[PDB]
Short mmCIF file of C-alpha atoms and ligand atoms in Angstrom, two decimals:
data_model
loop_
_atom_site.label_atom_id
_atom_site.label_comp_id
_atom_site.label_asym_id
_atom_site.label_seq_id
_atom_site.Cartn_x
_atom_site.Cartn_y
_atom_site.Cartn_z
CA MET M 1 8.11 45.79 -4.83
CA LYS M 2 8.90 42.86 -2.59
CA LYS M 3 11.18 40.30 -3.94
CA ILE M 4 10.55 36.65 -2.78
CA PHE M 5 11.82 33.13 -3.18
CA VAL M 6 9.87 30.08 -2.69
CA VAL M 7 11.60 26.66 -2.34
CA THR M 8 9.44 23.57 -2.88
CA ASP M 9 9.61 20.05 -4.27
CA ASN M 10 5.87 19.65 -4.62
CA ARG M 11 3.87 20.10 -7.76
CA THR M 12 0.67 20.89 -6.19
CA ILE M 13 2.16 23.34 -3.61
CA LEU M 14 4.22 24.91 -6.69
CA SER M 15 0.91 25.23 -8.51
CA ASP M 16 -1.09 26.73 -5.59
CA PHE M 17 1.45 29.22 -4.54
CA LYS M 18 2.02 30.48 -8.13
CA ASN M 19 -1.74 31.00 -8.19
CA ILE M 20 -1.91 32.87 -4.81
CA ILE M 21 1.27 34.84 -5.30
CA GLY M 22 0.92 35.74 -8.90
CA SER M 23 -2.45 37.29 -7.85
CA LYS M 24 -0.64 39.93 -5.83
CA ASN M 25 0.67 43.42 -6.49
CA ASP M 26 4.05 44.72 -6.12
CA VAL M 27 5.66 41.18 -5.75
CA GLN M 28 8.32 39.64 -7.77
CA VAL M 29 9.04 35.96 -7.06
CA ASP M 30 11.61 33.45 -8.00
CA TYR M 31 10.93 29.60 -7.61
CA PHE M 32 13.62 26.96 -6.67
CA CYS M 33 13.37 23.30 -6.28
CA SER M 34 15.99 20.54 -5.45
CA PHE M 35 18.27 18.60 -7.84
CA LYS M 36 16.78 15.30 -6.69
CA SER M 37 13.74 16.86 -8.31
CA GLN M 38 14.97 17.44 -11.95
CA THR M 39 12.52 14.91 -13.56
CA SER M 40 9.35 15.50 -11.51
CA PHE M 41 9.78 18.96 -12.50
CA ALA M 42 11.12 18.44 -15.99
CA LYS M 43 8.36 20.67 -18.04
CA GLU M 44 8.48 23.53 -15.54
CA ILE M 45 12.36 23.65 -15.23
CA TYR M 46 12.75 23.68 -18.91
CA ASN M 47 10.02 26.45 -18.96
CA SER M 48 11.94 27.94 -16.12
CA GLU M 49 8.79 28.32 -13.96
CA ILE M 50 11.44 26.81 -11.36
CA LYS M 51 15.12 26.19 -10.93
CA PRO M 52 17.17 23.67 -8.97
CA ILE M 53 19.61 24.93 -6.09
CA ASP M 54 21.79 23.29 -3.63
CA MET M 55 20.72 24.97 -0.46
CA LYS M 56 23.44 23.43 1.55
CA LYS M 57 26.08 24.75 -0.63
CA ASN M 58 24.73 28.06 -1.89
CA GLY M 59 21.59 29.06 0.08
CA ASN M 60 23.57 31.80 1.70
CA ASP M 61 24.05 33.28 -1.88
CA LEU M 62 20.37 34.29 -1.66
CA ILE M 63 21.10 36.54 1.20
CA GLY M 64 20.91 40.19 -0.09
CA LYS M 65 18.79 39.57 -3.21
CA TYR M 66 15.47 38.82 -1.52
CA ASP M 67 13.13 40.30 0.99
CA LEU M 68 11.32 37.18 2.07
CA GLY M 69 11.71 33.42 1.63
CA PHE M 70 9.22 30.51 1.85
CA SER M 71 9.91 26.85 2.18
CA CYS M 72 6.95 24.73 1.54
CA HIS M 73 7.35 20.76 1.05
CA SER M 74 11.02 21.29 0.15
CA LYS M 75 13.41 18.42 0.11
CA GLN M 76 16.18 20.91 1.81
CA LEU M 77 17.02 22.77 4.84
CA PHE M 78 17.93 26.39 4.80
CA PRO M 79 21.37 27.58 6.05
CA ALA M 80 21.45 29.36 9.43
CA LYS M 81 22.72 32.63 8.25
CA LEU M 82 20.10 32.75 5.36
CA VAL M 83 17.53 32.22 8.04
CA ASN M 84 19.02 34.50 10.61
CA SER M 85 19.55 37.22 7.73
CA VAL M 86 16.36 37.07 5.68
CA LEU M 87 12.81 36.49 6.93
CA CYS M 88 12.15 32.79 5.86
CA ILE M 89 8.89 31.26 6.55
CA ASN M 90 7.96 27.59 6.49
CA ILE M 91 4.56 26.21 5.40
CA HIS M 92 4.50 22.78 7.19
CA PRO M 93 2.28 19.61 7.08
CA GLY M 94 2.02 19.29 10.90
CA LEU M 95 0.79 20.96 14.00
CA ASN M 96 3.88 22.23 15.83
CA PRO M 97 5.13 21.49 18.28
CA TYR M 98 3.66 17.91 17.99
CA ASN M 99 5.51 15.19 15.89
CA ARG M 100 8.11 17.45 14.49
CA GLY M 101 10.19 15.74 11.86
CA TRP M 102 9.25 12.98 9.62
CA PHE M 103 5.79 12.03 8.46
CA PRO M 104 3.90 13.78 11.21
CA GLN M 105 0.59 12.47 9.99
CA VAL M 106 1.81 8.85 10.19
CA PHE M 107 2.97 9.37 13.79
CA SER M 108 -0.27 11.05 14.57
CA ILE M 109 -2.53 8.33 13.42
CA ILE M 110 -0.60 6.02 15.73
CA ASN M 111 0.20 8.04 18.83
CA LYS M 112 -2.69 10.39 18.78
CA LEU M 113 -0.84 13.62 19.24
CA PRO M 114 -2.61 16.44 17.15
CA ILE M 115 -1.85 16.78 13.54
CA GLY M 116 -2.71 19.92 11.41
CA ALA M 117 -0.80 22.37 9.51
CA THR M 118 1.66 25.25 10.65
CA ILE M 119 3.09 28.48 9.13
CA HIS M 120 5.98 29.54 11.16
CA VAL M 121 8.99 31.76 10.91
CA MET M 122 12.09 29.72 10.32
CA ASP M 123 14.75 29.38 13.07
CA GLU M 124 18.11 27.37 13.49
CA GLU M 125 15.96 24.33 14.62
CA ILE M 126 13.55 22.20 12.61
CA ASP M 127 9.90 23.05 12.80
CA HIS M 128 10.70 25.21 15.89
CA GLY M 129 10.30 29.13 15.46
CA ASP M 130 7.39 31.65 15.95
CA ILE M 131 4.10 30.45 14.78
CA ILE M 132 2.05 32.79 12.57
CA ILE M 133 -0.75 30.60 12.08
CA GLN M 134 -1.70 27.01 12.40
CA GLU M 135 -4.73 24.88 12.50
CA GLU M 136 -5.61 21.30 13.73
CA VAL M 137 -7.10 18.66 11.35
CA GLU M 138 -9.34 15.77 12.52
CA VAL M 139 -8.26 12.21 11.92
CA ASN M 140 -11.31 10.08 11.17
CA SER M 141 -11.60 6.28 11.63
CA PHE M 142 -11.73 5.39 7.90
CA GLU M 143 -8.67 7.58 6.92
CA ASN M 144 -5.12 6.56 6.17
CA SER M 145 -1.89 8.47 5.80
CA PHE M 146 -2.82 9.54 2.28
CA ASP M 147 -6.14 11.05 3.35
CA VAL M 148 -4.83 12.90 6.39
CA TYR M 149 -1.83 14.13 4.45
CA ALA M 150 -4.31 15.42 1.80
CA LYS M 151 -6.40 17.26 4.22
CA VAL M 152 -3.28 18.78 5.89
CA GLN M 153 -2.03 19.92 2.58
CA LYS M 154 -5.21 21.73 1.74
CA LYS M 155 -5.21 23.41 5.24
CA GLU M 156 -1.65 24.54 4.53
CA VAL M 157 -2.78 26.31 1.27
CA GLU M 158 -5.98 27.76 3.02
CA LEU M 159 -3.87 29.03 5.98
CA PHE M 160 -1.14 30.71 3.64
CA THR M 161 -3.97 32.16 1.41
CA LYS M 162 -5.27 33.75 4.87
CA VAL M 163 -2.05 35.08 5.99
CA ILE M 164 0.18 36.08 2.88
CA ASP M 165 -1.12 39.72 2.69
CA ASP M 166 -0.06 40.20 6.31
CA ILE M 167 3.32 38.64 5.80
CA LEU M 168 3.97 40.91 2.48
CA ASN M 169 2.84 43.87 4.64
CA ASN M 170 5.34 42.83 7.11
CA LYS M 171 2.81 43.08 9.90
CA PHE M 172 1.80 39.37 10.94
CA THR M 173 1.24 37.29 14.03
CA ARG M 174 4.09 35.77 15.78
CA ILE M 175 3.53 33.41 18.73
CA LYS M 176 6.04 31.33 20.58
CA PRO M 177 5.42 27.63 20.47
CA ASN M 178 4.01 26.67 23.94
CA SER M 179 6.22 23.73 24.58
CA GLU M 180 9.02 21.80 22.86
CA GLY M 181 6.64 18.97 21.92
CA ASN M 182 8.37 16.01 20.20
CA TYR M 183 10.53 15.03 17.18
CA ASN M 184 10.56 12.00 15.09
CA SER M 185 13.64 11.02 12.94
CA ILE M 186 13.64 9.37 9.66
CA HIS M 187 15.15 6.33 11.56
CA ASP M 188 12.21 6.41 13.96
CA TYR M 189 9.95 5.99 10.95
CA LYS M 190 12.23 3.31 9.39
CA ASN M 191 11.92 1.16 12.73
CA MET M 192 8.21 1.05 12.47
CA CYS M 193 8.04 -0.27 8.75
CA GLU M 194 9.05 -3.80 9.90
CA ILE M 195 5.92 -5.56 11.40
CA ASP M 196 6.66 -7.67 14.43
CA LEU M 197 4.25 -10.60 13.93
CA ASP M 198 4.58 -11.62 17.61
CA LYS M 199 3.75 -8.08 18.99
CA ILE M 200 0.68 -8.03 21.17
CA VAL M 201 -1.88 -5.34 20.28
CA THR M 202 -5.65 -4.53 20.16
CA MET M 203 -7.28 -4.80 16.83
CA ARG M 204 -7.72 -1.08 17.12
CA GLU M 205 -4.03 -0.62 17.35
CA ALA M 206 -3.12 -2.92 14.50
CA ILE M 207 -5.60 -1.02 12.38
CA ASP M 208 -4.47 2.27 13.21
CA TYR M 209 -0.89 1.08 12.70
CA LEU M 210 -1.93 -0.43 9.27
CA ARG M 211 -3.66 2.73 8.13
CA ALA M 212 -0.91 4.98 9.29
CA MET M 213 1.39 3.03 6.94
CA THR M 214 -0.92 3.12 4.06
CA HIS M 215 -0.16 5.91 1.48
CA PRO M 216 -0.28 4.94 -2.24
CA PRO M 217 1.61 4.59 -4.14
CA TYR M 218 4.23 3.93 -1.66
CA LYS M 219 5.30 0.59 -0.28
CA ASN M 220 5.85 0.90 3.63
CA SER M 221 4.98 -1.70 6.27
CA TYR M 222 6.35 -5.24 5.83
CA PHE M 223 6.81 -8.56 7.39
CA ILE M 224 9.38 -11.26 6.62
CA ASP M 225 7.60 -14.68 6.71
CA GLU M 226 8.92 -18.22 7.56
CA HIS M 227 10.43 -18.88 4.12
CA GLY M 228 12.05 -15.37 4.39
CA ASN M 229 9.58 -13.70 1.81
CA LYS M 230 9.18 -9.97 2.27
CA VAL M 231 5.40 -9.19 2.14
CA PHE M 232 4.27 -5.53 1.95
CA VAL M 233 0.87 -4.80 3.57
CA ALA M 234 -1.54 -1.91 3.08
CA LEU M 235 -4.96 -1.45 4.41
CA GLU M 236 -8.12 -0.37 2.68
CA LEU M 237 -11.16 1.18 4.55
CA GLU M 238 -14.58 2.28 3.42
CA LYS M 239 -17.13 3.99 5.25
CA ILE M 240 -20.55 2.68 4.47
CA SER M 241 -22.81 5.44 5.92
CA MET I 1 -26.87 -44.60 -21.73
CA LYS I 2 -26.24 -43.28 -18.25
CA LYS I 3 -28.46 -40.31 -17.31
CA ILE I 4 -26.91 -37.71 -15.30
CA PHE I 5 -27.88 -34.28 -13.84
CA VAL I 6 -25.63 -31.43 -12.72
CA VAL I 7 -26.53 -28.39 -10.49
CA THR I 8 -24.43 -25.32 -10.46
CA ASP I 9 -24.46 -21.58 -10.30
CA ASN I 10 -21.09 -20.86 -11.64
CA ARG I 11 -20.17 -20.14 -15.21
CA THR I 12 -16.76 -21.54 -15.31
CA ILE I 13 -17.60 -24.64 -13.53
CA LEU I 14 -20.58 -25.10 -15.92
CA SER I 15 -18.20 -24.89 -18.93
CA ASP I 16 -15.74 -27.02 -17.07
CA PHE I 17 -18.24 -29.77 -16.40
CA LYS I 18 -19.46 -29.56 -20.02
CA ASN I 19 -15.99 -30.15 -21.24
CA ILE I 20 -15.08 -33.07 -19.01
CA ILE I 21 -18.36 -34.87 -18.82
CA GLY I 22 -18.94 -33.98 -22.51
CA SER I 23 -15.86 -35.96 -23.62
CA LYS I 24 -17.19 -39.31 -22.30
CA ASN I 25 -19.40 -41.86 -24.02
CA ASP I 26 -22.78 -43.11 -23.26
CA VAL I 27 -23.86 -40.16 -20.90
CA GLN I 28 -26.76 -37.82 -21.31
CA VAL I 29 -26.35 -34.74 -18.96
CA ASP I 30 -28.97 -32.24 -17.90
CA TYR I 31 -27.86 -28.97 -16.17
CA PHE I 32 -29.55 -27.11 -13.57
CA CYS I 33 -29.29 -23.76 -11.67
CA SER I 34 -31.14 -21.69 -9.14
CA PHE I 35 -33.77 -19.20 -10.21
CA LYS I 36 -31.30 -16.62 -8.88
CA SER I 37 -29.07 -17.05 -11.95
CA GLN I 38 -32.16 -16.61 -14.14
CA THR I 39 -30.55 -13.36 -15.35
CA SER I 40 -26.97 -14.03 -15.12
CA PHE I 41 -27.31 -17.30 -17.16
CA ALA I 42 -30.32 -16.15 -19.46
CA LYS I 43 -28.27 -16.65 -22.62
CA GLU I 44 -27.36 -20.20 -21.58
CA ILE I 45 -31.03 -20.66 -20.55
CA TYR I 46 -32.07 -19.45 -24.12
CA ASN I 47 -29.67 -21.92 -25.67
CA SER I 48 -30.89 -24.74 -23.33
CA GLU I 49 -27.28 -25.29 -21.96
CA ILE I 50 -28.93 -25.16 -18.42
CA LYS I 51 -32.25 -24.88 -16.71
CA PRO I 52 -33.37 -23.31 -13.52
CA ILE I 53 -34.93 -25.47 -10.86
CA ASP I 54 -36.38 -24.80 -7.39
CA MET I 55 -34.71 -27.64 -5.51
CA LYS I 56 -36.53 -26.84 -2.28
CA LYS I 57 -39.95 -27.32 -3.77
CA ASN I 58 -39.66 -29.49 -6.91
CA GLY I 59 -36.30 -31.17 -6.62
CA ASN I 60 -37.95 -34.54 -5.79
CA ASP I 61 -39.58 -34.37 -9.37
CA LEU I 62 -36.08 -35.45 -10.58
CA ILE I 63 -36.59 -38.78 -8.57
CA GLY I 64 -36.86 -41.66 -11.17
CA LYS I 65 -35.09 -39.89 -14.15
CA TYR I 66 -31.45 -40.00 -13.45
CA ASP I 67 -28.87 -42.66 -12.52
CA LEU I 68 -26.18 -39.90 -11.27
CA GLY I 69 -26.27 -36.54 -9.58
CA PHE I 70 -23.50 -33.80 -9.26
CA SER I 71 -23.54 -30.57 -7.25
CA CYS I 72 -20.86 -28.14 -7.59
CA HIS I 73 -20.86 -24.51 -6.41
CA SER I 74 -24.62 -24.47 -6.42
CA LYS I 75 -26.80 -22.15 -4.12
CA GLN I 76 -29.32 -24.74 -3.30
CA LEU I 77 -29.72 -27.91 -1.04
CA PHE I 78 -30.70 -31.23 -2.76
CA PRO I 79 -33.71 -32.32 -0.86
CA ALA I 80 -33.27 -35.38 1.35
CA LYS I 81 -35.53 -37.63 -0.69
CA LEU I 82 -33.56 -37.07 -3.91
CA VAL I 83 -30.32 -37.66 -1.90
CA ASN I 84 -31.48 -41.13 -0.72
CA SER I 85 -32.98 -41.97 -3.97
CA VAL I 86 -29.83 -41.70 -6.16
CA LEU I 87 -26.18 -41.45 -6.02
CA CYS I 88 -25.47 -37.61 -5.35
CA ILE I 89 -21.86 -36.45 -5.20
CA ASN I 90 -20.76 -33.13 -4.10
CA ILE I 91 -17.60 -31.23 -5.40
CA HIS I 92 -16.73 -29.11 -2.58
CA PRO I 93 -14.30 -26.25 -1.80
CA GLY I 94 -13.13 -27.23 1.58
CA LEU I 95 -11.15 -30.04 3.23
CA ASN I 96 -13.72 -32.31 4.93
CA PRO I 97 -14.30 -32.71 7.65
CA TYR I 98 -12.55 -29.38 8.64
CA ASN I 99 -14.34 -26.11 8.46
CA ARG I 100 -17.50 -27.48 7.02
CA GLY I 101 -20.29 -25.19 6.16
CA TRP I 102 -19.61 -21.48 5.41
CA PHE I 103 -16.51 -19.99 3.57
CA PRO I 104 -13.98 -22.80 4.66
CA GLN I 105 -11.04 -21.01 3.44
CA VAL I 106 -11.81 -17.87 5.49
CA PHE I 107 -11.87 -20.01 8.80
CA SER I 108 -8.85 -21.96 7.71
CA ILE I 109 -6.72 -18.84 7.18
CA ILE I 110 -7.75 -17.86 10.85
CA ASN I 111 -7.96 -21.11 12.82
CA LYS I 112 -5.28 -22.94 10.74
CA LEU I 113 -7.17 -26.31 10.14
CA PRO I 114 -6.47 -27.45 6.65
CA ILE I 115 -8.20 -26.36 3.65
CA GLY I 116 -8.65 -27.85 0.18
CA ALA I 117 -11.03 -29.48 -2.21
CA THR I 118 -13.09 -32.64 -1.45
CA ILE I 119 -15.23 -34.69 -3.59
CA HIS I 120 -17.85 -36.64 -1.53
CA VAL I 121 -21.00 -38.59 -1.68
CA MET I 122 -23.86 -36.46 -0.43
CA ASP I 123 -25.95 -37.64 2.55
CA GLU I 124 -28.59 -35.76 4.75
CA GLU I 125 -25.99 -33.61 6.67
CA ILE I 126 -24.05 -30.72 5.31
CA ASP I 127 -20.33 -31.34 3.83
CA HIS I 128 -20.55 -34.87 5.33
CA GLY I 129 -20.79 -38.25 3.27
CA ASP I 130 -18.08 -40.70 2.22
CA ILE I 131 -14.92 -39.14 0.74
CA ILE I 132 -13.98 -40.17 -2.77
CA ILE I 133 -11.13 -37.92 -3.19
CA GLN I 134 -9.73 -34.84 -1.55
CA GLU I 135 -6.39 -32.84 -1.50
CA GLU I 136 -5.04 -30.02 0.85
CA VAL I 137 -3.82 -26.79 -0.63
CA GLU I 138 -1.08 -24.54 0.92
CA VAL I 139 -1.92 -21.14 2.42
CA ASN I 140 0.99 -18.87 1.94
CA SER I 141 1.46 -15.74 4.14
CA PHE I 142 0.80 -13.28 1.37
CA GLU I 143 -2.60 -14.89 0.27
CA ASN I 144 -6.08 -13.76 1.06
CA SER I 145 -9.34 -15.53 0.81
CA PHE I 146 -9.78 -14.86 -2.81
CA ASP I 147 -6.35 -16.22 -3.67
CA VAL I 148 -6.99 -19.40 -1.75
CA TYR I 149 -10.38 -19.93 -3.03
CA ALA I 150 -9.08 -19.68 -6.51
CA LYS I 151 -6.54 -22.45 -5.78
CA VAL I 152 -9.30 -24.56 -4.19
CA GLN I 153 -11.60 -24.03 -7.14
CA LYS I 154 -8.74 -24.97 -9.63
CA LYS I 155 -8.28 -28.19 -7.42
CA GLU I 156 -12.00 -29.16 -7.41
CA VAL I 157 -11.75 -29.38 -11.24
CA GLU I 158 -8.59 -31.32 -11.12
CA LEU I 159 -9.88 -33.89 -8.69
CA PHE I 160 -13.09 -34.36 -10.59
CA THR I 161 -11.12 -34.94 -13.94
CA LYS I 162 -9.27 -37.64 -11.97
CA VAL I 163 -12.41 -39.64 -10.54
CA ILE I 164 -15.05 -39.09 -13.16
CA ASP I 165 -14.17 -42.35 -15.01
CA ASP I 166 -14.47 -44.37 -11.81
CA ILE I 167 -17.69 -42.71 -10.81
CA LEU I 168 -19.03 -43.43 -14.27
CA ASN I 169 -18.13 -47.03 -14.07
CA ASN I 170 -19.72 -47.26 -10.56
CA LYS I 171 -16.56 -48.39 -8.81
CA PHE I 172 -14.87 -45.47 -6.97
CA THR I 173 -13.10 -44.86 -3.56
CA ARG I 174 -15.29 -44.15 -0.52
CA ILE I 175 -13.61 -43.50 2.74
CA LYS I 176 -15.34 -42.13 5.85
CA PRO I 177 -13.96 -38.89 7.36
CA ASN I 178 -11.49 -39.59 10.31
CA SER I 179 -13.83 -37.50 12.50
CA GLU I 180 -16.90 -35.32 12.67
CA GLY I 181 -14.56 -32.22 12.22
CA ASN I 182 -16.29 -28.86 12.80
CA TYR I 183 -19.12 -26.80 11.24
CA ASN I 184 -19.30 -23.10 10.92
CA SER I 185 -22.77 -21.52 10.53
CA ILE I 186 -23.95 -18.28 8.97
CA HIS I 187 -24.24 -17.19 12.61
CA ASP I 188 -20.50 -17.99 13.27
CA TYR I 189 -19.44 -16.24 10.02
CA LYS I 190 -21.43 -13.21 10.53
CA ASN I 191 -20.11 -12.68 14.21
CA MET I 192 -16.54 -13.19 12.81
CA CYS I 193 -17.26 -10.25 10.47
CA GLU I 194 -17.89 -7.63 13.16
CA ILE I 195 -14.44 -6.51 14.38
CA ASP I 196 -13.95 -6.23 18.13
CA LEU I 197 -11.63 -3.15 18.20
CA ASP I 198 -10.81 -3.99 21.87
CA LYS I 199 -9.82 -7.56 21.26
CA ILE I 200 -6.24 -8.26 22.16
CA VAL I 201 -4.31 -10.14 19.34
CA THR I 202 -0.73 -10.69 17.92
CA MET I 203 -0.06 -8.62 14.64
CA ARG I 204 0.14 -12.17 12.91
CA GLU I 205 -3.39 -12.66 14.03
CA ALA I 206 -4.55 -9.48 13.01
CA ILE I 207 -3.06 -9.76 9.66
CA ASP I 208 -4.30 -13.37 9.21
CA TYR I 209 -7.82 -12.20 10.20
CA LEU I 210 -7.93 -9.36 7.86
CA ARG I 211 -6.43 -11.27 4.82
CA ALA I 212 -8.95 -14.09 5.46
CA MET I 213 -11.60 -11.46 5.13
CA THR I 214 -10.46 -10.03 2.16
CA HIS I 215 -12.17 -11.19 -1.12
CA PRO I 216 -12.71 -8.76 -3.91
CA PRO I 217 -15.27 -7.55 -4.88
CA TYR I 218 -17.17 -8.27 -1.52
CA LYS I 219 -17.04 -6.21 1.63
CA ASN I 220 -16.87 -8.45 4.65
CA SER I 221 -14.96 -7.44 7.81
CA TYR I 222 -16.11 -4.09 9.43
CA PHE I 223 -15.76 -2.13 12.72
CA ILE I 224 -18.29 0.45 14.12
CA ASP I 225 -16.51 3.50 15.07
CA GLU I 226 -17.35 6.06 17.82
CA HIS I 227 -19.76 7.88 15.66
CA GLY I 228 -21.31 4.64 14.73
CA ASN I 229 -20.05 4.75 11.08
CA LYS I 230 -19.78 1.33 9.75
CA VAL I 231 -16.40 1.00 8.25
CA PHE I 232 -15.46 -2.01 5.96
CA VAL I 233 -11.77 -3.03 6.12
CA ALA I 234 -9.54 -5.09 3.70
CA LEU I 235 -5.94 -5.72 3.48
CA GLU I 236 -3.61 -5.88 0.54
CA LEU I 237 -0.32 -7.97 0.57
CA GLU I 238 2.28 -7.91 -1.95
CA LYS I 239 5.37 -10.22 -1.89
CA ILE I 240 8.12 -8.04 -3.40
C1 LIG S 301 8.91 8.79 0.63
C2 LIG S 301 7.58 8.34 1.20
C3 LIG S 301 6.37 9.11 1.41
N1 LIG S 301 5.25 8.55 1.92
C4 LIG S 301 4.21 9.51 2.19
C5 LIG S 301 4.32 9.97 3.59
C6 LIG S 301 4.75 11.45 3.44
O1 LIG S 301 4.03 12.22 4.48
C7 LIG S 301 4.14 11.75 2.25
C8 LIG S 301 4.77 12.96 1.29
O2 LIG S 301 6.11 12.64 1.29
P1 LIG S 301 7.00 13.19 -0.02
O3 LIG S 301 8.46 12.83 0.12
O4 LIG S 301 6.00 12.54 -1.14
O5 LIG S 301 6.53 14.62 -0.42
P2 LIG S 301 6.66 16.02 0.08
O6 LIG S 301 5.96 16.02 1.71
O7 LIG S 301 5.95 16.33 -1.14
O8 LIG S 301 8.16 15.94 0.30
C9 LIG S 301 8.90 17.05 0.62
O9 LIG S 301 8.38 17.65 1.79
C10 LIG S 301 8.83 17.03 3.02
C11 LIG S 301 8.49 17.76 4.25
C12 LIG S 301 10.25 16.44 2.96
N2 LIG S 301 10.63 15.91 4.30
C13 LIG S 301 10.67 15.60 1.74
O10 LIG S 301 12.10 15.36 1.71
C14 LIG S 301 10.29 16.45 0.57
O11 LIG S 301 10.53 15.71 -0.61
O12 LIG S 301 4.14 10.60 1.27
C15 LIG S 301 5.23 7.23 2.22
O13 LIG S 301 4.25 6.72 2.66
N3 LIG S 301 6.26 6.43 1.93
C16 LIG S 301 7.32 7.00 1.45
O14 LIG S 301 8.44 6.26 1.26
C1 LIG S 302 -21.29 -13.81 -0.96
C2 LIG S 302 -19.82 -13.58 -0.52
C3 LIG S 302 -18.77 -14.38 -0.99
N1 LIG S 302 -17.65 -14.21 -0.42
C4 LIG S 302 -16.44 -15.03 -0.79
C5 LIG S 302 -16.21 -16.20 0.06
C6 LIG S 302 -16.66 -17.36 -0.77
O1 LIG S 302 -15.76 -18.51 -0.62
C7 LIG S 302 -16.42 -16.98 -2.21
C8 LIG S 302 -17.33 -17.69 -3.16
O2 LIG S 302 -18.78 -17.81 -3.30
P1 LIG S 302 -19.49 -17.12 -4.44
O3 LIG S 302 -18.74 -16.07 -5.25
O4 LIG S 302 -20.92 -16.97 -3.91
O5 LIG S 302 -19.49 -18.03 -5.87
P2 LIG S 302 -19.60 -19.36 -6.36
O6 LIG S 302 -20.58 -20.48 -5.53
O7 LIG S 302 -19.84 -19.35 -7.79
O8 LIG S 302 -18.09 -19.48 -6.13
O9 LIG S 302 -16.63 -15.51 -2.12
C9 LIG S 302 -17.47 -13.27 0.34
O10 LIG S 302 -16.15 -13.07 0.81
N2 LIG S 302 -18.35 -12.49 0.88
C10 LIG S 302 -19.68 -12.54 0.51
O11 LIG S 302 -20.54 -11.97 0.84
#
């Protein structure tokens, strides 16, 4: 009777996991989310389908109570000794080791490194340890950050569905990542948000930039005009074929 | 009793002109439209508030019956015999002589020549005769073609309200354009609509181009991608 914890701040992921994991024998599972997340998850917390936790403070208190941990779309990072003492697996919206860090799909639309989904064993470093399973996702011309994120998310759930048995059976793939690849900080993102009106680019590049920064309902890219107006920009694309 | 004819394919222009002209004395006004609004105007047709006409063919059959002609957001050209037969005045959504012909505001957002409304006497050429009155409108950074056009169309009506009494009394300002300006044909406009993915531009330029091509509900600018899907693009801006 494996005992499992799952940390997420995503409703859709929370719902998919429950589905996949609740289907399984010999499994008990507690679900946690973050404190920043008290409202998004107000009906479910109150029903206690999930429970806030400060992983920074108290993550290490789950040592000894669980056999297996999962992080999927989780606002928080797991403490080292938790990760070094319990098997913790991350289900991640990018293709390690490319565009590790913040908003992988945004950076992929711009810099053309592969994007996809990875499930990997957690280590002390971010998006860094043994890969269990991962798959690339196509970026089409007509897609923005939101469409690519949504393909990635679905691939995530399909890949976890494919490997959850092996993991609960504690016999599963572990492959070293092939290079260190690259990381993008939240500051790297923030520096791209302000459009530089004088920057020289092809139309291809302006479009790829505008679509990479388009993800309803967020407001991301902007310019500051003459009169000091702050104007946010988003792009819409439609395939007519 | 001054006999006037008005040609439009726009509902709000139609009821605007009804309101303005309809508050004047000693005028009798007939309204016309293209056969292409037959359906979209059917209810006004049945109430004889307006009546389609095929200008190309039978426009000249208006010769002799009116003292004064107006065109405003019509789909049709007045035939030239009708033009030289009576005073015909165009109420026009551009600032003549800049960006005459197609979608003035779209070219102006890109090429920066002014935009505005112009009320002008019609001659045989397009967007060309003596200017009665016209006024520039501003293009702010956050506006697309829809936004600017709406401002221009509001201005058209304003200007017309200001000069209709003069025109009715047959003594109104007519100045010649300061130059021949420039004209943009359908061929110019269509070419502008296909994006050149390889063209080098500032981001200012990319954004001005795309906002100039944004005009809900239409789909205007597009690129052909590597699989030859035709992809239409539009931009949203939001001053915060
Ligand atoms: C905050 C924010 C998000 N987005 C887009 C791009 C992101 O890839 C996507 C989802 O981000 P999110 O914060 O909605 O939701 P998740 O990916 O659901 O978020 C969680 O998992 C991530 C791995 C963590 N880094 C986040 O802290 C955590 O909240 O939404 C934007 O376009 N603009 C934004 O300001
Ligand atoms: C027909 C069409 C119009 N437009 C925009 C540009 C034109 O300035 C604007 C107005 O033309 P239109 O809506 O044809 O109506 P009316 O003569 O009643 O105004 O719509 C497009 O952007 N694409 C199109 O295909």
